[PDB]
Amino acid sequence: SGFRKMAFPSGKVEGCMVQVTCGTTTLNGLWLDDVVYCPRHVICTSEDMLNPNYEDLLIRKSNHNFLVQAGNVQLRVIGHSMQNCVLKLKVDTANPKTPKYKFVRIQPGQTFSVLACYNGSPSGVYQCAMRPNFTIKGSFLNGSCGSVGFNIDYDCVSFCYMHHMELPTGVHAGTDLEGNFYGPFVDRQTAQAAGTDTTITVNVLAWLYAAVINGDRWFLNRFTTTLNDFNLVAMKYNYEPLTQDHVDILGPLSAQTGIAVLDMCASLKELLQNGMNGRTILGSALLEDEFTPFDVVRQCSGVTFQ
Amino acid sequence: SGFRKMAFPSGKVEGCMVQVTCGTTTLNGLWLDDVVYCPRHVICTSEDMLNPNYEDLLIRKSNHNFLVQAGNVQLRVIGHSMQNCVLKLKVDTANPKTPKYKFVRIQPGQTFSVLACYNGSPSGVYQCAMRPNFTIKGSFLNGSCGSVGFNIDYDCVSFCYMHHMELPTGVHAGTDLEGNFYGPFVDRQTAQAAGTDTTITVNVLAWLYAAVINGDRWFLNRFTTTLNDFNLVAMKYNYEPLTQDHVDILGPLSAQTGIAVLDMCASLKELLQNGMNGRTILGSALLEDEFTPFDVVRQCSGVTFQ
Ligand SMILES: *[C@H](O)[C@H](C[C@@H]1CCNC1=O)NC(=O)[C@H](CC(C)C)NC(=O)c1cc2c(OC)cccc2[nH]1
Numbered sequence: 001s002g003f004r005k006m007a008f009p010s011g012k013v014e015g016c017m018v019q020v021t022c023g024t025t026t027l028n029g030l031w032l033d034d035v036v037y038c039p040r041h042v043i044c045t046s047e048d049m050l051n052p053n054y055e056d057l058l059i060r061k062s063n064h065n066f067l068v069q070a071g072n073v074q075l076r077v078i079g080h081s082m083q084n085c086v087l088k089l090k091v092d093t094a095n096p097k098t099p100k101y102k103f104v105r106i107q108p109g110q111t112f113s114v115l116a117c118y119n120g121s122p123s124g125v126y127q128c129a130m131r132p133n134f135t136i137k138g139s140f141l142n143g144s145c146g147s148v149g150f151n152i153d154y155d156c157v158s159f160c161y162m163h164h165m166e167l168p169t170g171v172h173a174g175t176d177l178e179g180n181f182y183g184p185f186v187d188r189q190t191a192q193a194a195g196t197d198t199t200i201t202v203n204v205l206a207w208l209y210a211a212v213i214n215g216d217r218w219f220l221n222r223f224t225t226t227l228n229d230f231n232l233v234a235m236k237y238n239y240e241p242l243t244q245d246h247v248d249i250l251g252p253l254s255a256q257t258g259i260a261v262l263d264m265c266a267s268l269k270e271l272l273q274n275g276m277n278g279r280t281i282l283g284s285a286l287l288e289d290e291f292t293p294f295d296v297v298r299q300c301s302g303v304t305f306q
Numbered sequence: 307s308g309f310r311k312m313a314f315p316s317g318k319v320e321g322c323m324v325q326v327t328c329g330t331t332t333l334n335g336l337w338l339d340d341v342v343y344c345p346r347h348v349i350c351t352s353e354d355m356l357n358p359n360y361e362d363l364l365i366r367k368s369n370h371n372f373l374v375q376a377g378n379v380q381l382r383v384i385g386h387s388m389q390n391c392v393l394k395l396k397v398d399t400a401n402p403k404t405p406k407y408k409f410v411r412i413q414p415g416q417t418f419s420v421l422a423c424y425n426g427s428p429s430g431v432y433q434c435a436m437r438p439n440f441t442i443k444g445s446f447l448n449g450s451c452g453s454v455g456f457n458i459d460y461d462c463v464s465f466c467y468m469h470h471m472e473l474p475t476g477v478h479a480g481t482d483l484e485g486n487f488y489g490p491f492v493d494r495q496t497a498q499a500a501g502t503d504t505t506i507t508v509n510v511l512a513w514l515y516a517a518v519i520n521g522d523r524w525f526l527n528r529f530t531t532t533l534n535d536f537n538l539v540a541m542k543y544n545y546e547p548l549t550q551d552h553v554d555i556l557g558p559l560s561a562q563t564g565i566a567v568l569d570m571c572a573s574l575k576e577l578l579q580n581g582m583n584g585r586t587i588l589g590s591a592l593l594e595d596e597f598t599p600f601d602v603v604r605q606c607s608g609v610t611f612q
């Protein structure tokens with residue numbers, strides 16, 4: 001029992017992290033097979049970095065303008081190219097620690113682990129969600145760009161996130177590993193605004209089931225509701241609409257606990273209108289929305305990887 | 307910016323995890339150099355465990371009664387012995403992935419990362435604190451025993467925790483790697499009660515400084531307090547006493563921010579008497595107590611390892 005914000009074990013990813021230096025800019029890269037992926041804003045100087053033309057900036061570089069250090073070992077770069085907002089540096093050596101891996105684009109509401117890095121070195125690992133406004137609520141300092149977000153499925157690392165930007169609200173923005181940003185952000189040195197964020201309703205309900213599964217039931221009631229009556233209250237409280245999709249993939253949890261999805265919706269409604277009256281759920285005084293239904297099943301039944 | 311509950315990167319520990327089987331009981335062990343460490347209740351049969359005599363049970367075992375699997379590879383046990391609540395299994399092969407490592411016993415209030423495992427395989431990693439009642443608020447299913455908790459300083463893993471027990475309140479109890487329990491718990495199949503828990507006052511204060519550093523200042527006040535007038539209110543609210551040792555360890559954070567420790571104590575005082583009035587701090591509606599001052603400095607300055 002117990003329920004924690006849990007991250008994937010990070011060993012397959014640590015063995016891929018490297019340092020990339022172009023000029024006086026240093027950040028992190030990802031070494032897979034004979035390729036190193038990093039944020040393209042590594043080729044910027046502080047002046048380019050206000051409104052660069054990256055095509056121009058990259059035409060002006062050669063392979064020798066990029067220093068890639070895998071620990072002590074300096075890797076020799078033999079090619080480079082840009083794919084959207086990421087640079088791809090071809091090196092003369094395949095990474096012997098390359099895991100099985102995929103590149104994946106996640107949707108809003110899905111979670112992943114972030115291995116925050118500096119100068120090529122892991123500093124820590126935490127779990128995050130892609131918010132509905134396509135930002136992430138991260139923990140990132142200067143030098144962290146090029147840290148990756150990932151999931152592990154069985155034996156395979158699925159990379160889904162590379163870090164580029166911090167917004168003025170203190171939240172974070174990035175791309176997938178093909179360099180396409182999540183949301184409407186650009187890799188320039190400008191103050192950029194995110195859309196209004198919303199609560200991931202389906203994850204709140206999943207966490208409510210983790211609660212029940214761990215013996216927190218005080219918030220349950222004898223009532224039920226229709227999906228339409230529930231979304232009416234959801235809009236009032238800045239929650240994402242609940243779909244039938246969403247209802248369905250909560251089925252496993254609903255069945256495990258005996259509580260229909262729309263009974264649990266009725267408890268969320270009363271929690272929303274009445275608050276928590278100084279009580280807690282799974283150790284929190286807020287409705288938590290960064291666990292998916294599969295996160296909840298994984299943890300409340302001990303799925304392993306290797 | 308941003309502030310998350312961050313665990314250490316887990317790869318140095320992942321490469322030490324193995325599976326141990328005696329009879330039909332399977333759990334996790336830790337392989338360092340040519341020794342495998344695991345909970346001694348692996349030698350129990352389901353009936354032995356209401357109140358076993360482990361010295362009797364172990365004298366009844368031979369090396370061949372232990373199956374140790376490092377993945378596919380079965381390791382030969384060449385010796386065995388018990389140290390308090392852990393078994394030490396001599397194997398004929400030194401682990402090639404053995405990190406620099408220490409064994410450390412931690413105090414209450416200190417934090418560590420847990421690599422939860424099943425059948426030898428990493429499932430996830432999260433950060434915990436040793437509570438003042440010597441329990442941890444973990445997430446552990448059947449099969450998790452022998453999972454370890456740890457810190458990393460530079461290149462060295464300091465193991466501090468090995469998992470054995472779940473208490474009926476849903477929190478967890480275990481040993482150091484010399485097999486001595488934290489708190490008054492024993493490894494048998496009985497309902498065991500932990501003392502009342504208290505809040506780690508020094509960690510709350512550090513976390514208040516993490517807040518300020520990240521731009522949450524709403525809770526600050528013009529006031530100050532004496533360490534004793536502050537400790538009077540704390541006892542009333544089940545907070546641990548603040549010492550001058552604690553005051554001293556908050557020096558760096560106090561200095562980074564410009565806020566004297568006892569000005570911040572006067573802010574914690576008002577939060578306890580008046581609550582947070584529907585506000586949050588660092589995304590939490592409760593006062594968080596599982597960050598030490600050095601967790602806060604590390605994360606808010608990007609300290610790395612290797
Ligand atoms: C790379 O490591 C870094 C990550 C960033 C630093 C602090 N915490 C983080 O997550 N990325 C940057 O510094 C990028 C560089 C651009 C060119 C891609 N810049 C931003 O994140 C950024 C720039 C501005 C800004 O311009 C004056 C105003 C306000 C916010 C802001 N953020």
Ligand SMILES: *[C@H](O)[C@H](C[C@@H]1CCNC1=O)NC(=O)[C@H](CC(C)C)NC(=O)c1cc2c(OC)cccc2[nH]1
Nearest residue numbers: 446447448449450451471472474493494495496497
């Ligand atoms: C080992 O893997 C397992 C870990 C434990 C199982 C479920 N969640 C966990 O953290 N450890 C145990 O099962 C131990 C074994 C003894 C022999 C050390 N037993 C308990 O944790 C335990 C037994 C009882 C109990 O009696 C049956 C009543 C109430 C609580 C409780 N906890």
